[PDB]
Amino acid sequence: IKGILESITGFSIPLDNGEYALYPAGRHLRGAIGYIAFNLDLPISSKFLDFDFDDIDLLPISKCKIFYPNSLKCPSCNEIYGSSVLRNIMARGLSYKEVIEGKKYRLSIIVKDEKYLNEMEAIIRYILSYGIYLGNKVSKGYGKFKIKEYSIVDILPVKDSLLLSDAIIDNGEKDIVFSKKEISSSKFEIIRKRGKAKGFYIGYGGLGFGEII
């Protein structure tokens, strides 16, 4: 799905060792659409609960095109992103960090099979009327993301030997952490892997995690 998401309200997404994700990842888009899909009775929620489905990250866009890889430099204009966008928030005995809103981000949800499109089109309609909430403190109003554009373009995969997002391969020096929090199961797990660094898609841990640019 080709589109542009505007962060209406800022998002807070923490990681280990002290740092924050400089933009929202595809796992958060996957989680939030899974939450909407369970709240709409659409039959894609079991596929969401499955963590190895390819059947179905959000990178910032530039003054040009998309920012490419903690700093993300622009390909053409060579504008710089990162560590001028994170902002510290001390609020009522809490100290977290967020991203300033008003910035535009890519859409990356590529359905490999046509059979669920309708379904994906349906939830895009919900987003186009209500918005998607990505990150921490979702119920406090944080992490709002409106859609500015929407279209559907088919994509042929890579016909080459860079990693725009991150990847999960063997043993790595880096460490990537995602989670599974199943509603109507009372289960939450901060599951751990190592993976490679950054700079079709998968490879090889998950569908909404790997990217080959």
Partner: protein
């Protein structure tokens, strides 16, 4: 399943203060204004609105006679406000937006001088500048309630009337933040 979507329109009747939380933006603003209002980078105004709704429902349901936890203590998970506005485990059904202004900063946000006057000498002992929202400024929100019940619109509207009488944001005792909240409910299936 069904869900309830409540559009909250908000008109400001007495000036509104919500303190800015972004530290770098605060210290960028501290050379001029000692109390910057909570502002976006889209030059719009942010108001926390789940805390006011939850606190209003906690004091009202506690003074009615129901068994509701008082935050200020972990949430119990079995009361009405834990089933509606969240508990440590069970997420809240009622996601409540920030109260985003329909206008930008330059139309509604003004730097205003406040005093501290000596009681005997009757002169301005101290001085400060704080940013405040003008009155008649219209804020919008939409709150989303998943798997609603019968006592869903009534509790939200009653907490909304508690915020009308009490106020929202900071400097609540001085008369700041007295607002009026229109509403518009809809059911999405």
């Amino acid at each position: 399943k069904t869900m309830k979507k409540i559009y909250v329109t908000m008109k400001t009747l007495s000036p509104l203060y919500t303190g800015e939380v972004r530290r770098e933006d605060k210290e960028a603003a501290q050379k001029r204004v000692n109390f910057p209002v909570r502002k976006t980078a889209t030059n719009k105004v942010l108001i926390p609105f789940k805390g006011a709704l939850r606190s209003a429902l906690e004091i009202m349901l506690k003074a009615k006679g129901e068994n509701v936890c008082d935050t200020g203590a972990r949430p119990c998970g079995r009361c009405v406000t834990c089933s509606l506005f969240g508990s440590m485990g069970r997420a809240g059904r009622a996601s409540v937006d920030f109260l985003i202004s329909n206008d930008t900063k330059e139309q509604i946000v003004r730097e205003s001088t406040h005093l501290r006057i000596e009681r005997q000498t009757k002169s301005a002992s101290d001085t400060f500048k704080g940013e405040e929202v003008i009155e008649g400024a219209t804020f919008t929100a939409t709150i989303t309630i998943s798997n609603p019940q019968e006592k869903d619109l009534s509790l939200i509207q009653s907490a909304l009337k508690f915020i009308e009488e009490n106020g929202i944001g900071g400097w609540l005792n001085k008369g700041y933040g007295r607002v009026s909240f229109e509403v518009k409910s809809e059911d999405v299936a």
